[PDB]
Structure 1
């Protein structure tokens, strides 16, 4: 669920899920349309695509359990939806951590009209 994801982001990046990643680019937080603005925006695009592969699960509200083995994120055995959601977030977190160095504030609160373009998962 989102309680898990946000906690994961903070631990990983140090920035806070909301508002650092709840309204960035064209995909973080708001999904929909567009061409991802930057690397962090691409993690969101890929992440949204990740939840999209799980039709009958509830990413936002189904809680899962994960642990750290010296820094590694280890998703714990749960329902199979819980296992797959967890993997989807673990990636976003890793991806987020990987492009902290290019996280740019001008994409914060990014306006919608500026997000039109085509991208299939």
Structure 2
């Protein structure tokens, strides 16, 4: 679920999901069009694609379970949707951590009109 993803992000990065990742660049928090602004934004682009791979799942509300094995995120077995949703979120949280070094506050609340063109998943 969005709230779970949010807590996973905070655990991973030390940044609050809202507002650090809820309106960042072209794809974080609301994505759809444009060339991603940086690596962090590409994390969201890929996460959007990941959810897009699951048309008949509901990642905003469906809750999954996971555990930490010495830092590592391990998705635990639920329904197929939950498993796949968890793997998407896990990847994004890792991606955000891997790109904290280039995160830029200038891309927070990035305006929609600077995000143009469709980029295929």
Q: Is the 8 A contact 2:32 2:118 kept in 1?
A: no
Deviation per residue, 1:87-107 (Å, 9 max, x gap): 000000000000001000110
4+ long deviations beyond 2 Å:
none
Unaligned runs of at least 5 residues, structure 1 = none
Alpha-carbon distance in structure 2 between the residues aligned to 1:29 and 1:112: 12
Q: Is the 8 A contact 2:43 2:96 kept in 1?
A: yes
What corresponds to 1:40 in structure 2?
Answer: 40
Unaligned runs of at least 5 residues, structure 2 = none
Alpha-carbon distance in structure 2 between the residues aligned to 1:65 and 1:109: 31
Deviation per residue, 1:17-51 (Å, 9 max, x gap): 00100000000001111100000000000000000
Q: SS of the counterpart of 1:113?
A: helix
Shift of 1:3: 1.5
- Would you say how many aligned residue pairs link Structure 1 and Structure 2? 121
Question: CA RMSD of the aligned region, Å?
Answer: 0.5
Structure-2-length-normalised TM-score: 0.99
